[PDB]
Amino acid sequence: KAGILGVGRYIPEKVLTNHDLEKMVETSDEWIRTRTGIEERRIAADDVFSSHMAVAAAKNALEQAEVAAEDLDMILVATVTPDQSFPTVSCMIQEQLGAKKACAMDISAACAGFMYGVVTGKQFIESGTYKHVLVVGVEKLSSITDWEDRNTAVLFGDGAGAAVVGPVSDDRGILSFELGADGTGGQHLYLNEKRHTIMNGREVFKFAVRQMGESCVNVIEKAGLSKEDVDFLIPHQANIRIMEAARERLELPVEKMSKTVHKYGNTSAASIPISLVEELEAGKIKDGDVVVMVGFGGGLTWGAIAIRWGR
Amino acid sequence: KAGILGVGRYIPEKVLTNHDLEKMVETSDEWIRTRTGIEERRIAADDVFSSHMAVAAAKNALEQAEVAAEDLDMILVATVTPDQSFPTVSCMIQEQLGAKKACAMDISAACAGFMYGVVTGKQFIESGTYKHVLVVGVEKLSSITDWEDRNTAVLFGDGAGAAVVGPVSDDRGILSFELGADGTGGQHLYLNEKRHTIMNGREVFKFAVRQMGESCVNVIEKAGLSKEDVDFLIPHQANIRIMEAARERLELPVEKMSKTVHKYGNTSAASIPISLVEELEAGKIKDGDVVVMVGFGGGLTWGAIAIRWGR
Numbered sequence: 001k002a003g004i005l006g007v008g009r010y011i012p013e014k015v016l017t018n019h020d021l022e023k024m025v026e027t028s029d030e031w032i033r034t035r036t037g038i039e040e041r042r043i044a045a046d047d048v049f050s051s052h053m054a055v056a057a058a059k060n061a062l063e064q065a066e067v068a069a070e071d072l073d074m075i076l077v078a079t080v081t082p083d084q085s086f087p088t089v090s091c092m093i094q095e096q097l098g099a100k101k102a103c104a105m106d107i108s109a110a111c112a113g114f115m116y117g118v119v120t121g122k123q124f125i126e127s128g129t130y131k132h133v134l135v136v137g138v139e140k141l142s143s144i145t146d147w148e149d150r151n152t153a154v155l156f157g158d159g160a161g162a163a164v165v166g167p168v169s170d171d172r173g174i175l176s177f178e179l180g181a182d183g184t185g186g187q188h189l190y191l192n193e194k195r196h197t198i199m200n201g202r203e204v205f206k207f208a209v210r211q212m213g214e215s216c217v218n219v220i221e222k223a224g225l226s227k228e229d230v231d232f233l234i235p236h237q238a239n240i241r242i243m244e245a246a247r248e249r250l251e252l253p254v255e256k257m258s259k260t261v262h263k264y265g266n267t268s269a270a271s272i273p274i275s276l277v278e279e280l281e282a283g284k285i286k287d288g289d290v291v292v293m294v295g296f297g298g299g300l301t302w303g304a305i306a307i308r309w310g311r
Numbered sequence: 312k313a314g315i316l317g318v319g320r321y322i323p324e325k326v327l328t329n330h331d332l333e334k335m336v337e338t339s340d341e342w343i344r345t346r347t348g349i350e351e352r353r354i355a356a357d358d359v360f361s362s363h364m365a366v367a368a369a370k371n372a373l374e375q376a377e378v379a380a381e382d383l384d385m386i387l388v389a390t391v392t393p394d395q396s397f398p399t400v401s402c403m404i405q406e407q408l409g410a411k412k413a414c415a416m417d418i419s420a421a422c423a424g425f426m427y428g429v430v431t432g433k434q435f436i437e438s439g440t441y442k443h444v445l446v447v448g449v450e451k452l453s454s455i456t457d458w459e460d461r462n463t464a465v466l467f468g469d470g471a472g473a474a475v476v477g478p479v480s481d482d483r484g485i486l487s488f489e490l491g492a493d494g495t496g497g498q499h500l501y502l503n504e505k506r507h508t509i510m511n512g513r514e515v516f517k518f519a520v521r522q523m524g525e526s527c528v529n530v531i532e533k534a535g536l537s538k539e540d541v542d543f544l545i546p547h548q549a550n551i552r553i554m555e556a557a558r559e560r561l562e563l564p565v566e567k568m569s570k571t572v573h574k575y576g577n578t579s580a581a582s583i584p585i586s587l588v589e590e591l592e593a594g595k596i597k598d599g600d601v602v603v604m605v606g607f608g609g610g611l612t613w614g615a616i617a618i619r620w621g622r
């Protein structure tokens with residue numbers, strides 16, 4: 001069984017507060033907090049790109065996993081903001097990490113990308129093909145934000161998270177998963193000709209508030225478990241109201257759902273692993289815990305994983 | 312075992328001849344032919360994007376496979392020229408094809424992308440997770456070509472190729488594969504700030520002429536076969552001199568190597584499946600044939616597959 005051997009992240013230093021944003025566009029700290037839950041989000045420096053953030057997250061994850069870059073068989077990077085289209089971020093960090101035997105691709109599934117990558121890595125490991133797969137979710141959303149558009153500029157931040165995936169013992173490891181998509185919703189969230197993100201907020205909200213809870217129940221079910229068996233929920237961190245609907249569907253207490261949206265905003269493919277590190281560092285996730293992760297992104301993509309933490 | 316159930320392509324109508332290119336830049340039909348083997352390459356219309364080409368190729372492949380879009384579990388699209396970064400091409404055709412149950416991601420490994428996708432699909436099928444995986448290599452290289460740069464503008468064309476991957480019977484199916492990368496070579500082939508491809512031609516040539524033959528021998532070996540067992544070789548169609556080195560390494564006759572570079576030029580991730588359709592339509596590939604495919608791309612990525620044709 002494939003499981004998670006270690007996790008790491010890179011959080012940019014610069015903080016953008018809601019009062020910072022009150023000078024940039026016509027918004028209010030009150031509106032942002034009440035409608036999204038966001039208070040702050042980090043912004044990468046103009047000389048910091050997805051590659052920089054991804055290699056930092058990756059090093060932390062390799063160190064925590066006790067895995068040398070030399071032993072990586074594959075590097076997957078979920079991003080829509082590579083430094084450039086090619087060389088990919090995965091190729092770049094394969095070089096900067098010294099993972100010379102690893103293959104490398106970038107995958108594109110917007111905010112669900114980390115879920116696609118972890119599941120892809122699982123297949124390569126449980127086939128016996130590969131042993132160690134590095135999976136990075138990284139996004140410099142600030143580089144594709146129209147910073148004069150209040151409807152999106154108060155939502156996005158930058159960051160990177162990474163996990164080393166590999167064989168784990170006994171009951172441990174990824175128990176079940178779900179990947180999905182609906183291109184019908186492509187009109188509702190797209191990158192335009194200016195490299196500016198355009199969103200029909202209300203439409204994405206309606207779709208996500210239904211699909212995130214259903215994907216969660218689906219993986220619990222496929223894992224042969226009950227709602228009562230879930231120890232922690234790590235949803236995509238885009239809107240506290242969407243996260244709360246998922247929590248309600250799983251009948252989980254507040255303390256069993258990761259919430260970092262108030263401090264990092266929506267970091268797309270980086271959001272789940274960033275939150276995962278936060279709870280691990282807080283000691284809130286233990287070996288043996290059944291953890292449900294669920295993500296939702298542009299193109300209308302989604303994914304979910306049930307994992308039993310530990311090696 | 313996962314194998315290829317059907318294949319299809321989309322070839323743009325507009326032909327760009329070497330004499331067409333003689334008016335655009337300072338080149339000669341003689342130089343282009345002697346140094347690359349290219350005579351013509353197709354160019355998509357200004358209103359034709361990767362999504363259009365990919366859906367056309369995909370329909371042809373579904374029809375040949377006798378597979379309804381409704382039954383697709385996953386759509387992978389290898390491209391670096393999506394209509395826009397998100398919605399992805401895979402999401403867009405998931406919609407246009409009516410493949411509502413399928414998940415969808417785009418993967419990025421430049422000219423090796425189709426190989427990464429097929430191998431990814433194999434893992435999902437041989438795990439028992441999925442049954443039908445659509446894999447498309449599509450590129451509108453004309454949209455990232457500096458058409459005033461002779462060093463690259465005489466090399467690239469547009470197109471799309473697609474395969475339906477699924478379980479096949481007995482000895483059939485993908486016998487072995489290799490995926491690799493070397494981010495060290497990222498400096499030698501990259502997309503610049505103008506969305507223009509920049510290449511150190513001589514350096515990419517040196518690397519590809521060594522790696523393509525070695526990847527071929529590696530998959531033959533892992534499949535437990537000999538050079539004498541190979542019935543056909545489908546290399547990436549970028550330079551007849553690079554293809555010829557691979558042929559020489561495998562001691563294969565001319566007639567057992569696909570050559571379409573003279574008519575389509577380098578179409579990156581689309582090149583191998585386009586050539587595969589060409590030989591199938593010519594009747595040169597039969598059920599039971601051991602086919603070696605090998606590709607090499609920017610970021611310095613590469614991949615190879617040995618497959619026994621048939622279902």
Ligand SMILES: CC(C)(COP(=O)(O)OP(=O)(O)OC[C@H]1O[C@@H](n2cnc3c(N)ncnc32)[C@H](O)[C@@H]1OP(=O)(O)O)[C@@H](O)C(=O)NCCC(=O)NCCS
Binds near residue numbers: 031036111242
């Ligand atoms: C984007 C989102 C935060 C907006 O919240 P919402 O409840 O949809 O808000 P609405 O779009 O209905 O607009 C509510 C009002 O606030 C206004 N408004 C929008 N952005 C505002 C801002 N930054 N500051 C103040 N008012 C704002 C709207 O114009 C509207 O005013 P009106 O009623 O006078 O026309 C929310 O829909 C969302 O997060 N959607 C899901 C997106 C997701 O899942 N994340 C992935 C994105 S990559």
Ligand SMILES: CC(C)(COP(=O)(O)OP(=O)(O)OC[C@H]1O[C@@H](n2cnc3c(N)ncnc32)[C@H](O)[C@@H]1OP(=O)(O)O)[C@@H](O)C(=O)NCCC(=O)NCCS
Binds near residue numbers: 553
């Ligand atoms: C790009 C490539 C066709 C160029 O051929 P090459 O043998 O490397 O040619 P060189 O770069 O050594 O240049 C040879 C000469 O031709 C010239 N030249 C380059 N492009 C030319 C053109 N279009 N027309 C005429 N002369 C040209 C060079 O300036 C040089 O002239 P010089 O000796 O006076 O300086 C070849 O290197 C190649 O295909 N490389 C591999 C790329 C690959 O694998 N494909 C992936 C790309 S996405």
